[PDB]
Structures are given as structure tokens and as C-alpha cells.
Design an enzyme around this catalytic site. Structure first.
Site, PDB file in Angstrom:
ATOM      1  N   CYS A 111      61.210  73.922 -31.444  1.00  0.00           N
ATOM      2  CA  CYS A 111      61.864  75.045 -29.879  1.00  0.00           C
ATOM      3  C   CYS A 111      60.716  76.480 -30.207  1.00  0.00           C
ATOM      4  CB  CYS A 111      63.464  74.766 -30.329  1.00  0.00           C
ATOM      5  SG  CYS A 111      64.084  76.807 -29.542  1.00  0.00           S
ATOM      6  N   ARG A 114      64.117  79.863 -30.683  1.00  0.00           N
ATOM      7  CA  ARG A 114      65.033  80.008 -31.666  1.00  0.00           C
ATOM      8  C   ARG A 114      65.220  81.193 -31.184  1.00  0.00           C
ATOM      9  NH1 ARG A 114      63.287  76.529 -36.108  1.00  0.00           N
ATOM     10  NH2 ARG A 114      61.115  76.608 -35.542  1.00  0.00           N
ATOM     11  N   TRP A 283      66.922  79.036 -20.922  1.00  0.00           N
ATOM     12  CA  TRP A 283      66.487  78.878 -19.881  1.00  0.00           C
ATOM     13  C   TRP A 283      64.545  78.579 -20.165  1.00  0.00           C
ATOM     14  CZ3 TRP A 283      69.028  83.521 -22.494  1.00  0.00           C
ATOM     15  CH2 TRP A 283      67.784  83.806 -23.557  1.00  0.00           C
ATOM     16  N   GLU A 288      56.175  75.146 -19.384  1.00  0.00           N
ATOM     17  CA  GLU A 288      57.524  74.265 -18.603  1.00  0.00           C
ATOM     18  C   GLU A 288      57.548  73.393 -17.421  1.00  0.00           C
ATOM     19  OE1 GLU A 288      60.720  73.706 -21.805  1.00  0.00           O
ATOM     20  OE2 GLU A 288      60.520  76.045 -20.847  1.00  0.00           O
TER      21      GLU A 288
END
Ligand code: HEM
Ligand code: HEM
Ligand SMILES: Cc1cc(N)nc(CCc2cc(F)cc(C#CCN(C)C)c2)c1
Ligand SMILES: Cc1cc(N)nc(CCc2cc(F)cc(C#CCN(C)C)c2)c1
Ligand SMILES: C[C@H](O)[C@H](O)[C@H]1CNc2nc(N)[nH]c(=O)c2N1
Ligand SMILES: C[C@H](O)[C@H](O)[C@H]1CNc2nc(N)[nH]c(=O)c2N1
Ligand SMILES: [Zn+2]
Lengths: 412, 416
Positions: A111, A114, A283, A288
Site C-alpha cells: 500500500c 500508508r 481514496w 488506478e
């Protein structure tokens, strides 16, 4: 045993000691690196094994609040030991559940987002008993997280697994996703990634409007029962029409995407307890949607159409028309979300944020597990600082893990 | 044991058995993945007869299997001959055929190389009779001329004498045969290639008169038989260069950019049957992104995104305009345009990754595997619109192999 990582753009060298606290396994050996395997057996998921796991978790919990080796610590270890010997499992205090959820995000080595890990809003849904109740909790989460475009991170945690026959599961992979249907002419309408799920929705009884961007219904399984369909109220689903700040023909493509990325099919592991339904949301990073969702060949794969509208030379791959359209598509996604005041981050800001997060984690925690294959954005990799950053990947707990798709598992 | 890798774009699944023949370490363990560490100690490179026979035998078993002569009298005699040469002389000499085979397979085993589809067509130049730095210079010039081939580039490797006691090494001190100088200014700015500042200073200290321009081809610094290195200027007519222009942007030529056509790596160590060839420069042709993404646009390199975006009149105040991404594409279009217009061999990252996927599938079928480092194989721009991004890869170390070695100025004992 005290490992160094170097940044080759800045010469910054960090020293990792946190990996020594690693519990789970990587899938690699000294003979073979599986760093690029999408989901090895490890990243997927008795009385004996449970108490050491509880002890490890409680010890780090009480260390975080500076009460390691305190009365309260020993008493809680005692109490959980007592409850495990008796009930064969145990229940987390609210404070420990919040801690475990925040740290499962903190430990998510894949991720990039973070740096926000500590601001997570934890919704305790452990009193939920039915799919209708799950629906209620999920609507409240979506509305809380969406916040009229000012997105807020959230997780909603349904009751933990008990004997594996009483599982709570969200059958959707994300709370909000567009349907996918195979076509009579052979192609695919909507999102090809969701063709199988969209079929099971109809197989369970959905009435699909067979459009291109149809928000899928929720398929909710409470207490191991058969799962139930529910439509998310459209007024809770914030969508963004995709337009470009230059190409006015862009809007005629008909593109839109939803504001809230909300992963709903992972397993949350805290102190050995397993939360099989734990939808979480933050969000989007712009790539992506624009790189993966729009331009993957196994997804909406709009590159060829956008390139034609741009009148690029698509004869020879060496004109880099794919790369040119890719950039414009991603300019537009960011432009559209920002115009409609929906939270979004571009890959330059997110990756710069992550480097600062790494620096903070190395300085205050001794390390930061990180999966370079996933942290590096899928476009313009080497002009982002993460590309030049050496990362160590190891598995800490609490954690988010993968789990088999329910329809393979569910005894009907 | 079987090992499966999946392509997540096409659902193709392949089975790896070749990883069983893997000898060296990765750096990873069950508890930590070192997959993004640039130079793990296991990838970097004083060796006794003790461990050398099994390394020679393993190599010769491989060699004779490839030529369908495993267990033949020729195979056994060669093993016997190598055995006696090691115990008598503490090392051994490769036949020409073995050297060619080893060098091809070190390329074939290079898990970070996307260009490996071409591995079988390597031109191997045996320079094992070389004895002086002047001899090395001559061999390297001939390599450059042969490989350049007036722009129709040909892969080649030149193999200088192997290590003996580690005190008589042949080394090419340049990291690449052709590279531009970098000069640190007193004001902190860098003239030329910031990557080569330290090596430029060495050359200057060694007596190089530096032109102090932005694209000065560095001299060769060549060390033979463990002696102090000597400076040589590659004849400029041997250095093919491409001026960089853009097919639509006429102002791009005025940026004053050029690059050399021949990528020639010269600081790595070739390992074959436990023999260590510390000077083995090899060359292929460029993938466009090596120049246009890394060489021009890395913050630590020529770092021209700012000027290009300025000239394109891009919105540079918010990063979310993706002006860096936009300028990066234009630059890489220009590199590919310039090379193709001058008929200098180049491959774009779309073509190269597609070919590598075909190579990789072929290697699984005919060889049982293809070790690949995803972190290095995936191109530095447009990653997921290339097919390697979606391709699971297994990384392991096979020999023969190319290995890193320390920079010679850190280890060399100076005679004076
Ligand atoms: C707040 C902004 C956030 C951003 C920008 C962000 C960004 C990302 C991105 C880009 C990925 C790569 C995955 C993909 O490409 O599909 C990822 C993976 C992941 N994210 Fe974050 N995320 C955010 C919030 C969160 C939150 C709130 C959680 C959990 C509470 C979380 C947990 C994870 C996990 C567990 C994975 C990887 C799953 C795996 O192991 O494969 N993220 N994230
Ligand atoms: C023929 C055209 C070739 C192409 C297009 C090509 C492409 C590449 C690229 C793009 C990389 C990574 C580049 C980087 O540092 O960013 C690489 C690495 C590498 N190449 Fe190839 N290459 C070619 C030929 C060769 C040849 C002829 C050899 C040796 C005989 C070779 C051996 C290697 C090795 C050993 C590496 C890995 C270096 C490391 O471990 O860091 N390549 N190649
Ligand atoms: C909370 C959140 C924020 C964000 N900005 N984006 C996402 C989606 C990225 C993601 C996260 C995750 F935890 C799993 C998967 C997956 C999958 C299936 N497959 C690719 C392995 C994707 C989630
Ligand atoms: C033959 C060849 C072809 C090509 N197209 N390109 C190259 C250069 C890529 C390369 C190869 C190598 F063997 C080492 C390094 C390096 C370095 C320093 N550091 C970043 C690790 C780079 C070489
Ligand atoms: C930290 C990371 O390993 C390092 O930046 C790597 C990433 N991938 C790469 N890939 C290639 N081809 N070349 C490189 O120099 C690098 N650098
Ligand atoms: C095979 C490879 O692991 C796969 O394509 C990975 C690569 N890196 C990724 N990185 C992110 N962020 N998301 C992904 O889905 C993937 N997919
Ligand atoms: Zn690994």
C-alpha cells in the site's frame, strides 16, 4: 541481520531492524525469489496456536501505550488466556480492535497510501447478525467515507470467524464496481474483470440493466448463510464524469468512474482472530483508474479508441501513441475528480508522500515493509522517487490477507 | 518440484522446473524479500582448487549435454584433463567452444536482461592472449567497430584473461565503453553526465585533458595483468552518435542533445565453470527508454524534463497536470525518432517486452524455465501497458553468469 536500504536518487541510507519482528512468511527462499507472484499461498488464508498469537498482539498493544509489563498488561494477558482456555477463542476490546485495524493498514507492504494509516475511522460492526444489517452498516460506511467528495478513510469490521461455517463475507471484491457481461458478438460490455461476479448476481437473482457502467448490487453473507442482494442507494454512490481539460471530444467517450475505492474481499487478522468481512476504503490514486481500470487489455481497454480520437500514428508501436494516450487519459481522470471536488491523489504526490512515510517509519519504528512491485506506479515509474528506493518486503501482523472467493467455498 | 507462474492479462500458466538446477543464492529468505535491492552481496564478486573441480564438472556436464555428448569418451576425457590441470596448476583453461557456450549462457541466464531473445547470436571475441593495456585497447576498438557496424548493431563480447590469484586482474575501469564525462562545478551544478563525475575525476587525475563539454566521450582506462591502468582515447570515427531531434517539435534539436549508439557494459564479471573473467565488455543495442527515461530524465542524470516541459509550455505549477509524464513521452519519441532516422539499431519498450514474453514462453517449453527479475524487466515508463507487467516471474541464479564486482579504484593496489 540489521539491514540497509539505499535510495539511488538521493544516496539516503536507512537501517531496518523491524523485519526481525516478522512473523509470517514471504514465499521466497535463498534459492528463488517470488517477489513478483501476485498471490502466493502465504498472502492467502485450534486452541493451541491461538494463545501465542494473542500474546504477541497484546504485548505490542501494551508496548504502544507504554504499559508493557504493567498491571493492566498482565491482567489482560491473564484474562485473554482465561477466555481462550474456556471459549476456545476470545473477543477484542474496542481499543485493541482499533489498534489492530490501524496496524493492519500500517503493515500492508503493498500500500502506497500508508502515510495516512493512523487517521483510520474504525466502525465496529461485531454486533451485526444478518445481511440486512450488514447492508445498513455498509451504507453508513459508504456515506461516512464519501463525505460529499471529501473522502475519509474507514473500515467496517463484521464478526470474526468462529468455526468457519458461520462466516461473514462480502462477495463483492469492492463495494462499488461496474458490471460486466459477455456479448452476443463475442466481446465484453462493461468491466471484463467482473463478468463472473455479474453472472453470479443474475444467478442469485439480480436484474441487470445490461449497460456499461452499472453499479453492481451488494451480495452479503451473514453467519455463513446464503448471501443476499441489495442495491446501494444511488445517492450514496459518488461518480465522476470523465472529461479532459483540452480535448472536448473526450466527454463523448462516455467515461465515468466512482469516487470511493473500497476493498471488501480481504481478511483482517488481529491477534490470531480472523475477520473475513472487513470492507475498507480510502481514496484513489489517479493511475488506478486511468492506467489500470481504463487501459488494461483485460479491462475497459480504451487506449485504441482514445488514440484514434487523438489522430496518432498507430501504425508502428515506436511512435509511442499508447504512451501518449495513456498520459492524456490520466490527465483527464485527475482533472475530472479535482473539478468535481472528489479527493484524488496523483502518482507523483502519493509516491513522494510514501518516501516521507518510509523515512518516518524507519526513524520512529525501525522499518517499513514495502513491496516494490506494487508501490511503483504502473506509469512513469522511474520519474517517481519510489522507483530508486530500495525496499524490504516482509510480513508483519496485524495484517490484511487474501482469501478464496466465497462461491468456491460456500456450502450452499 | 513444480513451480507455476501466471500471466494475469492472458491467463497463460507456465511450469518452471529449471529453478531446481539453481546454485547461487538470491538474498531472500522465508522471512524477507530482497527483490528490490540493487546489488545484493549475492550478485557481486581468490578461489581454491577445493571448490573449483565441482564448478568445472557442473559446467562441463552442462556443456556436453547441450552438444548431445553427455557421458561420451570426449566428455570423460575432458573431465579428466580438466581435473589434472586443476590439481597440477590450481586453475584450468576453457576450450574456445566452451568459452563461446559459457558467454552465451551467461547472457541467457541474466535474469535482469529484457533483451535475451537474442542470446544465441552473440559474437564472442577471445582476447585471452592479451597481455598489456595497449593490447586491450586494440581488442576493444575492434569490438566497437564490429558491434557498431555503421549503425546495424551486432551483439558482441570480448573476453580478456581470467583471474588467477586476484593480484593480476584484467579490468576495464569504465562502467561502459562509451560514456559522457561529468564535471562538478564549483557552484554545485554538474556539466555533462552526473553519473560519471567520479570516474571523470579519476581520468583527469590520470592525465586526461578534459574538453569540459556536455557530451565528451570518456577515455578508456584499461588495466592489464594487475598493472596500473592506462589512458586511451577511442578514435572518434569509431564512436557513432545520434543527434536528438523530435518529429513534430522543431525546437527539440536546439536543446543540443545527442547520444551514442552503442551500449557496451564493461565493468561486470563473467563467471564460467568457476573461472572468473573480470574484464569481459559486452554490447548490444539500446532500448529507447534507457536513454530517454533514465539517461535524460533521472533527477540524478541529465535531468531535462524541466527544460522540455518549459519549451512545451506545460502547466508546471501542479504535478497533477502530469507535465513530467507528458515531457517524458515526447523525449522518448524523439530518441526513437532520431535513432531510426539515422538507421541506428534501437528497440522501443513495447517491442522489446513483447519479444521477451515470447522468448520467456519458449524458454519454459524448451528449457523448463526462464529466470527473470520483474523489478528490472518492467520498463521505467508505461509499465502496465507492456505485457511483462502482468507476467509473474521467478528469479533465481544460474551459472554461467554475469556478476557485479567492486569498482577497481576501491580495490587496486597502485604500483606508481
Ligand atoms: C487513503 C488513501 C489510499 C491510497 C492512495 C491507497 C493506495 C493503494 C494502491 C495504489 C494500492 C495498489 C493496489 C492496486 O494497484 O490495486 C494499494 C494496496 C493496498 N492498500 Fe492502500 N490505499 C489507501 C488506503 C488504504 C486503506 C484505508 C487501507 C486499509 C485500511 C489500505 C490497504 C491496502 C492493502 C491491504 C493493499 C494491498 C493488498 C495486497 O496485499 O495485495 N489502503 N493501496
Ligand atoms: C541485444 C540487445 C539488448 C538489449 C535491448 C538489452 C536490454 C537490457 C536492459 C534494458 C537492461 C536493464 C538496463 C538498465 O540498467 O536499466 C539489461 C540488463 C542486462 N543485460 Fe541486456 N540487453 C541487450 C543485450 C545484452 C547482451 C549482449 C548482454 C551480455 C552478453 C546483456 C546482458 C545483460 C545483463 C547481465 C544485464 C543485467 C545487469 C544487472 O544485473 O544489473 N544484455 N539489458
Ligand atoms: C482502500 C483502497 C484505496 C485505493 N486507493 N485503492 C484501493 C484498491 C487497490 C487494491 C487494494 C487491495 F487491498 C487489493 C486489491 C486487489 C486486488 C485483486 N488483484 C489485483 C490481486 C486492490 C483500495
Ligand atoms: C548490452 C546492453 C544492452 C542494452 N540495451 N543496455 C545495456 C546497459 C544496461 C546495463 C547492463 C548491465 F549489465 C549493467 C548495468 C548497470 C548498471 C549500474 N547500476 C544501475 C546497476 C546496465 C547493455
Ligand atoms: C531500487 C531498485 O532496485 C532500483 O531503482 C532499480 C529498479 N529497477 C531497475 N530496472 C532497470 N532496468 N534498471 C535499473 O537501474 C533499475 N533500478
Ligand atoms: C505479475 C505482477 O505481479 C502483477 O502484474 C502485479 C504487478 N504489480 C502490481 N502493482 C499494483 N499496484 N497492482 C497490481 O495489480 C499489480 N499487479
Ligand atoms: Zn524475494
Amino acid at each position: 541481520r540489521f539491514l540497509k536500504v539505499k535510495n539511488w536518487e538521493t544516496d539516503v541510507v536507512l537501517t531496518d531492524t523491524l523485519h526481525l519482528k516478522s512473523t509470517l512468511e514471504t514465499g521466497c527462499t535463498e534459492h528463488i525469489c517470488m517477489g513478483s507472484i501476485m498471490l502466493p499461498s502465504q498472502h492467502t488464508r485450534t486452541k493451541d496456536q491461538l494463545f501465542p498469537l494473542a500474546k504477541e498482539f497484546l504485548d505490542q498493544y501494551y508496548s504502544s501505550i507504554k504499559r508493557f509489563g504493567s498491571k493492566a498488561h498482565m491482567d489482560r494477558l491473564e484474562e485473554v488466556n482465561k477466555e481462550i482456555e474456556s471459549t476456545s477463542t476470545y473477543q477484542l476490546k474496542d481499543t485493541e480492535l482499533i489498534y489492530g485495524a490501524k496496524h493492519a493498514w500500517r503493515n500492508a507492504s503493498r500500500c502506497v497510501g500508508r502515510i495516512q494509516w493512523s487517521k483510520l475511522q474504525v466502525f465496529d460492526a461485531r454486533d451485526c447478525t444478518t445481511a440486512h444489517g450488514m447492508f445498513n452498516y455498509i451504507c453508513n460506511h459508504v456515506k461516512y467515507a464519501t463525505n460529499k467528495g471529501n473522502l475519509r478513510s474507514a473500515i467496517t469490521i463484521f464478526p470474526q470467524r468462529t468455526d468457519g461455517k458461520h462466516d461473514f463475507r462480502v462477495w463483492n471484491s469492492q463495494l462499488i464496481r461496474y458490471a460486466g457481461y459477455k456479448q452476443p458478438d463475442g466481446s465484453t460490455l462493461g468491466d471484463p474483470a467482473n463478468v463472473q461476479f455479474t453472472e453470479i448476481c443474475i444467478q442469485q437473482g439480480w436484474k441487470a440493466p445490461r449497460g456499461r457502467f452499472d453499479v453492481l448490487p451488494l451480495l452479503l453473507q451473514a453467519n455463513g448463510n446464503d448471501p443476499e442482494l441489495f442495491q446501494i442507494p444511488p445517492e450514496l454512490v459518488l461518480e465522476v464524469p470523465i472529461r479532459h481539460p483540452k480535448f472536448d471530444w473526450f466527454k463523448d467517450l462516455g467515461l465515468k468512474w466512482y469516487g470511493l475505492p473500497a476493498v471488501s474481499n480481504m481478511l483482517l487478522e488481529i491477534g490470531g482472530l480472523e475477520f473475513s468481512a472487513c470492507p475498507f476504503s480510502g481514496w484513489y490514486m489517479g493511475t488506478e483508474i486511468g492506467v489500470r481500470d481504463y487501459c488494461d487489455n483485460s479491462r475497459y481497454n480504451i487506449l485504441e479508441e482514445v488514440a484514434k480520437k487523438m489522430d496518432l500514428d498507430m501504425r508502428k508501436t515506436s511512435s509511442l501513441w499508447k504512451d501518449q494516450a495513456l498520459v492524456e487519459i490520466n490527465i483527464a481522470v485527475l482533472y475530472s475528480f479535482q473539478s468535481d471536488k472528489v479527493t484524488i491523489v496523483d502518482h507523483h504526490s502519493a509516491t513522494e508522500s510514501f518516501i516521507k512515510h518510509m523515512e518516518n517509519e524507519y526513524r520512529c519504528r525501525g522499518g517499513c515493509p514495502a513491496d516494490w512491485v506494487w508501490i511503483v506506479p504502473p506509469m512513469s515509474g522511474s520519474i517517481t522517487p519510489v522507483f530508486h528506493q530500495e525496499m524490504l518486503n516482509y510480513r508483519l501482523t496485524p495484517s490484511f490477507e487474501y482469501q478464496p472467493d466465497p462461491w468456491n467455498t460456500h456450502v450452499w
